[PDB]
PDB file of all heavy atoms in Angstrom:
ATOM      1  N   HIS D 363      12.990  32.464 -17.740  1.00 68.44           N
ATOM      2  CA  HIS D 363      13.468  31.909 -16.453  1.00 68.44           C
ATOM      3  C   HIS D 363      12.572  32.303 -15.321  1.00 68.44           C
ATOM      4  O   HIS D 363      12.913  32.165 -14.150  1.00 68.44           O
ATOM      5  CB  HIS D 363      14.876  32.310 -16.187  1.00 68.44           C
ATOM      6  CG  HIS D 363      15.887  31.781 -17.171  1.00 68.44           C
ATOM      7  ND1 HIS D 363      16.371  32.501 -18.208  1.00 68.44           N
ATOM      8  CD2 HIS D 363      16.420  30.533 -17.287  1.00 68.44           C
ATOM      9  CE1 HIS D 363      17.190  31.764 -18.929  1.00 68.44           C
ATOM     10  NE2 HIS D 363      17.229  30.559 -18.407  1.00 68.44           N
ATOM     11  N   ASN D 364      11.331  32.775 -15.617  1.00 66.91           N
ATOM     12  CA  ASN D 364      10.370  33.111 -14.553  1.00 66.91           C
ATOM     13  C   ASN D 364      10.087  31.913 -13.706  1.00 66.91           C
ATOM     14  O   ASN D 364       9.940  30.770 -14.189  1.00 66.91           O
ATOM     15  CB  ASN D 364       9.080  33.655 -15.212  1.00 66.91           C
ATOM     16  CG  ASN D 364       7.953  33.782 -14.198  1.00 66.91           C
ATOM     17  OD1 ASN D 364       8.113  34.306 -13.110  1.00 66.91           O
ATOM     18  ND2 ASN D 364       6.796  33.248 -14.588  1.00 66.91           N
ATOM     19  N   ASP D 365      10.072  32.086 -12.381  1.00 64.76           N
ATOM     20  CA  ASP D 365       9.772  30.985 -11.447  1.00 64.76           C
ATOM     21  C   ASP D 365       8.272  30.867 -11.105  1.00 64.76           C
ATOM     22  O   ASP D 365       7.883  29.860 -10.507  1.00 64.76           O
ATOM     23  CB  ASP D 365      10.564  31.145 -10.173  1.00 64.76           C
ATOM     24  CG  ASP D 365      10.148  32.336  -9.310  1.00 64.76           C
ATOM     25  OD1 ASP D 365       9.466  33.260  -9.883  1.00 64.76           O
ATOM     26  OD2 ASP D 365      10.451  32.370  -8.110  1.00 64.76           O
ATOM     27  N   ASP D 366       7.487  31.850 -11.503  1.00 64.57           N
ATOM     28  CA  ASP D 366       6.061  31.918 -11.096  1.00 64.57           C
ATOM     29  C   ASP D 366       5.148  31.500 -12.242  1.00 64.57           C
ATOM     30  O   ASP D 366       4.537  32.292 -12.905  1.00 64.57           O
ATOM     31  CB  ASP D 366       5.694  33.317 -10.609  1.00 64.57           C
ATOM     32  CG  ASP D 366       4.307  33.387 -10.013  1.00 64.57           C
ATOM     33  OD1 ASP D 366       3.689  32.306  -9.940  1.00 64.57           O
ATOM     34  OD2 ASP D 366       3.864  34.458  -9.663  1.00 64.57           O
ATOM     35  N   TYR D 367       5.072  30.175 -12.432  1.00 64.45           N
ATOM     36  CA  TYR D 367       4.251  29.597 -13.486  1.00 64.45           C
ATOM     37  C   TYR D 367       3.565  28.392 -12.890  1.00 64.45           C
ATOM     38  O   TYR D 367       3.983  27.784 -11.910  1.00 64.45           O
ATOM     39  CB  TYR D 367       5.061  29.235 -14.721  1.00 64.45           C
ATOM     40  CG  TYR D 367       6.182  28.193 -14.474  1.00 64.45           C
ATOM     41  CD1 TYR D 367       5.918  26.824 -14.560  1.00 64.45           C
ATOM     42  CD2 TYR D 367       7.440  28.632 -14.203  1.00 64.45           C
ATOM     43  CE1 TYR D 367       6.955  25.930 -14.366  1.00 64.45           C
ATOM     44  CE2 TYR D 367       8.489  27.721 -14.006  1.00 64.45           C
ATOM     45  CZ  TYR D 367       8.222  26.391 -14.063  1.00 64.45           C
ATOM     46  OH  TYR D 367       9.242  25.493 -13.872  1.00 64.45           O
ATOM     47  N   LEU D 368       2.472  27.977 -13.533  1.00 66.88           N
ATOM     48  CA  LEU D 368       1.889  26.635 -13.330  1.00 66.88           C
ATOM     49  C   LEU D 368       2.129  25.795 -14.579  1.00 66.88           C
ATOM     50  O   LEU D 368       2.330  26.324 -15.687  1.00 66.88           O
ATOM     51  CB  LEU D 368       0.370  26.778 -13.059  1.00 66.88           C
ATOM     52  CG  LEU D 368      -0.040  27.715 -11.943  1.00 66.88           C
ATOM     53  CD1 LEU D 368      -1.616  27.845 -11.952  1.00 66.88           C
ATOM     54  CD2 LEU D 368       0.462  27.237 -10.558  1.00 66.88           C
ATOM     55  N   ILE D 369       2.105  24.487 -14.444  1.00 66.88           N
ATOM     56  CA  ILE D 369       2.119  23.592 -15.594  1.00 66.88           C
ATOM     57  C   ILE D 369       0.750  22.992 -15.836  1.00 66.88           C
ATOM     58  O   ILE D 369       0.248  22.239 -14.979  1.00 66.88           O
ATOM     59  CB  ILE D 369       3.168  22.465 -15.468  1.00 66.88           C
ATOM     60  CG1 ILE D 369       4.571  23.028 -15.396  1.00 66.88           C
ATOM     61  CG2 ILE D 369       2.979  21.443 -16.652  1.00 66.88           C
ATOM     62  CD1 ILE D 369       5.665  21.991 -15.366  1.00 66.88           C
ATOM     63  N   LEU D 370       0.161  23.293 -16.978  1.00 68.39           N
ATOM     64  CA  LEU D 370      -1.163  22.774 -17.338  1.00 68.39           C
ATOM     65  C   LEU D 370      -1.025  21.660 -18.343  1.00 68.39           C
ATOM     66  O   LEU D 370      -0.267  21.826 -19.333  1.00 68.39           O
ATOM     67  CB  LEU D 370      -2.009  23.900 -17.936  1.00 68.39           C
ATOM     68  CG  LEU D 370      -3.403  23.549 -18.482  1.00 68.39           C
ATOM     69  CD1 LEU D 370      -4.353  23.163 -17.286  1.00 68.39           C
ATOM     70  CD2 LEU D 370      -3.975  24.656 -19.274  1.00 68.39           C
ATOM     71  N   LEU D 371      -1.656  20.503 -18.107  1.00 67.56           N
ATOM     72  CA  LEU D 371      -1.566  19.373 -19.018  1.00 67.56           C
ATOM     73  C   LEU D 371      -2.836  19.302 -19.903  1.00 67.56           C
ATOM     74  O   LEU D 371      -3.932  19.573 -19.405  1.00 67.56           O
ATOM     75  CB  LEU D 371      -1.432  18.048 -18.224  1.00 67.56           C
ATOM     76  CG  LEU D 371      -0.150  17.984 -17.363  1.00 67.56           C
ATOM     77  CD1 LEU D 371      -0.079  16.709 -16.552  1.00 67.56           C
ATOM     78  CD2 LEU D 371       1.102  18.221 -18.245  1.00 67.56           C
ATOM     79  N   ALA D 372      -2.642  18.956 -21.179  1.00 69.47           N
ATOM     80  CA  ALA D 372      -3.673  18.743 -22.153  1.00 69.47           C
ATOM     81  C   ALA D 372      -4.647  19.949 -22.239  1.00 69.47           C
ATOM     82  O   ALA D 372      -5.864  19.772 -22.588  1.00 69.47           O
ATOM     83  CB  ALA D 372      -4.420  17.400 -21.898  1.00 69.47           C
ATOM     84  N   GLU D 373      -4.162  21.132 -21.909  1.00 70.80           N
ATOM     85  CA  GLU D 373      -4.997  22.344 -21.935  1.00 70.80           C
ATOM     86  C   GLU D 373      -6.308  22.066 -21.138  1.00 70.80           C
ATOM     87  O   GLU D 373      -7.365  22.688 -21.452  1.00 70.80           O
ATOM     88  CB  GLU D 373      -5.293  22.813 -23.350  1.00 70.80           C
ATOM     89  CG  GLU D 373      -3.998  23.102 -24.182  1.00 70.80           C
ATOM     90  CD  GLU D 373      -4.285  23.733 -25.548  1.00 70.80           C
ATOM     91  OE1 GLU D 373      -5.136  24.627 -25.651  1.00 70.80           O
ATOM     92  OE2 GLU D 373      -3.573  23.358 -26.507  1.00 70.80           O
ATOM     93  N   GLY D 374      -6.211  21.287 -20.106  1.00 69.60           N
ATOM     94  CA  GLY D 374      -7.363  21.070 -19.240  1.00 69.60           C
ATOM     95  C   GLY D 374      -8.311  19.951 -19.702  1.00 69.60           C
ATOM     96  O   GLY D 374      -9.276  19.660 -18.986  1.00 69.60           O
ATOM     97  N   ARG D 375      -8.058  19.390 -20.870  1.00 73.48           N
ATOM     98  CA  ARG D 375      -8.828  18.263 -21.365  1.00 73.48           C
ATOM     99  C   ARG D 375      -8.397  16.983 -20.688  1.00 73.48           C
ATOM    100  O   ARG D 375      -7.351  16.920 -20.092  1.00 73.48           O
ATOM    101  CB  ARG D 375      -8.721  18.113 -22.912  1.00 73.48           C
ATOM    102  CG  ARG D 375      -9.494  19.035 -23.770  1.00 73.48           C
ATOM    103  CD  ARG D 375      -9.089  20.462 -23.647  1.00 73.48           C
ATOM    104  NE  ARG D 375      -9.775  21.297 -24.621  1.00 73.48           N
ATOM    105  CZ  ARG D 375      -9.853  22.596 -24.614  1.00 73.48           C
ATOM    106  NH1 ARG D 375      -9.178  23.341 -23.707  1.00 73.48           N
ATOM    107  NH2 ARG D 375     -10.615  23.242 -25.509  1.00 73.48           N
TER     108      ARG D 375
END
Side-chain angles (χ1 to χ4, degrees):
Chain D
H363 295 101
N364 168 49
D365 69 341
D366 187 3
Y367 60 87
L368 308 171
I369 295 184
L370 176 69
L371 300 177
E373 304 187 41
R375 279 66 172 165

